[PDB]
Ligand binder design. Structure first.
Ligand SMILES: COc1ccc2c(C(=O)Nc3ccc(NC(=O)c4nn(C)c5ccccc45)cc3C)cnn2c1
Ligand code: NI
Length: 274
């Protein structure tokens, strides 16, 4: 079929009557996530924006990773509904978030080879985001989605940014998850692909521990103080030393000394094929 839209609606608009919401999967501050059906036969995930939590323009900006980047390693945007309640429709990921999947009976049983494969799959998606001049800014296991075939995809919830001059600076009152955030981003609000690399090293600890919180037994101030002295996270239990040394490259003090996502992908592939 290669041989064969109103301006006031989004270019990605679908009529709401093409969707049937079936099961509530979760609820947050910005809204609820549902499993639904598009035109009866296609399973979809629908995010309904909570009326008042944030502006329509920010939730539906064309800036904007999902509208701009498509890749097998990235959760695919399907459509939007721009009349209230605002819907964001995406491909359905049967096994949900990686952090939840790792705690299920099948996730607990994952061999180290499968955990490294999944880590290589995230680095592959991040190598695409890097090459496209984007930063993710919230790279943690909670934002990785898992398919029915146990493949991983990166999801964006509005923090990803197109970088023009290699860096984005966050606002004065911005609050980020401290345990995943690189020192230069905590201190100066400066986010680059290199602060995503730092975050990936933290995400690797969530993968190897089957969803445990990074820096066990430590508060956010104790984490910042430790980092300032040159300490890094204590070797997690059941963490292969080779993986720990790859995590440490991600945690180099100078952002420019941290590896690229392509390098990380290449090493992780070698780790699970060896
Ligand atoms: C089985 O359990 C589960 C649980 C969850 C899911 C999802 C899922 O979560 N998909 C998904 C991913 C990202 C978004 N994006 C946003 O919510 C969004 N918010 N802002 C502010 C944005 C700004 C710009 C762009 C996007 C956004 C929406 C959905 C719907 C897919 N399968 N699946 C299965
Ligand atoms: Ni054709």
């Amino acid at each position: 079929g290669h041989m064969q839209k109103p301006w006031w609606e989004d270019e990605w608009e679908v009529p709401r009557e093409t969707l049937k919401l079936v099961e509530r999967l979760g609820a947050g501050q910005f809204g609820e996530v549902w499993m639904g059906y598009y035109n009866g036969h296609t399973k979809v995930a629908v995010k309904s924006l909570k009326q008042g939590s944030m502006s329509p323009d920010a939730f539906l900006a064309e800036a904007n990773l999902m509208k701009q980047l498509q890749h097998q390693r990235l959760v695919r945007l399907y459509a939007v509904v721009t009349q209230e309640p605002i819907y964001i429709i995406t491909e359905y990921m049967e096994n949900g978030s990686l952090v939840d999947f790792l705690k299920t009976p099948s996730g607990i049983k994952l061999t180290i080879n499968k955990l490294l494969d999944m880590a290589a799959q995230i680095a592959e998606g991040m190598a695409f985001i890097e090459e496209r001049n984007y930063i993710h800014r919230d790279l943690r296991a909670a934002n990785i989605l898992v398919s029915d075939t146990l493949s991983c995809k990166i999801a964006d919830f509005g923090l990803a940014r197109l970088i023009e001059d290699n860096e984005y600076t966050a606002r004065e009152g911005a609050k980020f998850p401290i345990k995943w955030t690189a020192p230069e981003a905590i201190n100066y609000g400066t986010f680059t692909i290199k602060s995503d690399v730092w975050s990936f090293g933290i995400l690797l600890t969530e993968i190897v521990t089957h969803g445990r919180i990074p820096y066990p037994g430590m508060t956010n101030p104790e984490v910042i103080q430790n980092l300032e002295r040159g300490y890094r996270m204590v070797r997690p239990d059941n963490c292969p030393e080779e993986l720990y040394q790859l995590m440490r490259l991600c945690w180099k003090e100078r952002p420019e000394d941290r590896p690229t996502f392509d390098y990380l992908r290449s090493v992780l592939e070698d780790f699970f094929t060896a």
